[PDB]
């Protein structure tokens, strides 16, 4: 049974996030919500306070088969600030671990800090423009190896959808969840 | 500028309520959620603890011009079992504000308690052959007067920008608020 870390800090664009988390426990994938934070607490973009399974400097040893990493603009800028997620990005990283930012986060995160390593990549806006090693391709969803990003939040769902597949490694429940709440997979 | 509740009970469809809260937000339409009884914390279906704006016993004079009512196999439950919920969705319902109910709600709170006033409306899955006196349609999102309901996770996109639209008596704004999350609406 597989487990994914769903990294929120101050102001991740929590739409991105619940989404995402809402697909994969419904197909009863372990996630956890890591606090990048002091405290559990901590409130997204649009002002909703939640309370995290965990904070990252808790779960700094784990070995999580997905990492999710939200956008929002103060969020990801948030993430790319802070010396733990970079370093369990990379660790996750290299040990092939499935990476999978979503909106800015994949321009913020990994491409301001030079982490995309030429993999194609789509992320929002034209973000991209000052992202110098990485091959931005507009599309829902881009896969390289084991970088999966999601362009924005209207494709959340086949960002969703497509991380639980991989992660699964068969579509039959995946596209049974998607029956269930209507959207065609 | 248009007031938004949204109703939070144990157990709320967190998928449903956030993404529809986000929407209204960008749009800069005001939102409170309320948590339904003693608590401002709430746990949604999927796990996840939200901290409420307020509660419905703070805003019992409070008229909002739009009410959400999220679904929630036990959301839903806790919804139709509560009197202040049913109370404050009667006086909105009365005074023509909109009520908006998504996925099992609209079988679950309003029909439960033969308050859909034999309106045309959509829930999830095959609730409504229990619903008495609706009109259950089959489509994304079926508006008729002032009740705007959403027939599952899938169509919430459709349904937020639906109600916006409504709220905002103007498609320009939400279209534009659409494409610049890359949702084709
Ligand atoms: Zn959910
Ligand atoms: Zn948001």
């Not at 607490?41 to 649009?46: D, E, L, N, T």
């Not at 996750?92 to 999978?100: F, R």
């Not at 930012?101 to 194609?120: E, T």
């Not at 090693?133 to 924005?152: C, H, M, Q, R, W």
Request: net charge negative; proline share 5%.
């Amino acid at each position: 049974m597989k487990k994914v870390a769903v990294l929120l800090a101050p102001g991740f664009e929590e739409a991105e996030a619940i989404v995402t988390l809402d697909i994969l426990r419904r197909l009863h994938i372990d996630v956890e919500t890591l606090a990048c934070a002091e405290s559990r607490a901590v409130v997204s973009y649009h002002d909703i306070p939640m309370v995290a399974d965990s904070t990252l400097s808790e779960r700094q040893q784990a070995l999580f088969d997905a990492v999710v990493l939200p956008g929002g603009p103060q969020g990801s800028a948030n993430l790319a600030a802070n010396p733990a997620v970079i370093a369990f990005v990379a660790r996750h990283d290299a040990a092939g671990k499935l990476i999978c930012p979503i909106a800015s986060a994949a321009a913020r995160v990994l491409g301001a800090h030079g982490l995309l390593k030429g993999r194609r990549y789509v992320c929002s806006g034209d973000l991209w423009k000052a992202v110098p090693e990485g091959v931005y391709v507009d599309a829902p969803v881009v896969e390289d190896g084991n970088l999966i990003s999601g362009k924005g939040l209207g494709h959340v769902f086949d960002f969703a959808l497509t991380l639980s597949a991989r992660l699964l490694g068969d579509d039959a429940p995946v596209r049974e969840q998607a029956e269930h709440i209507y959207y065609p997979w």
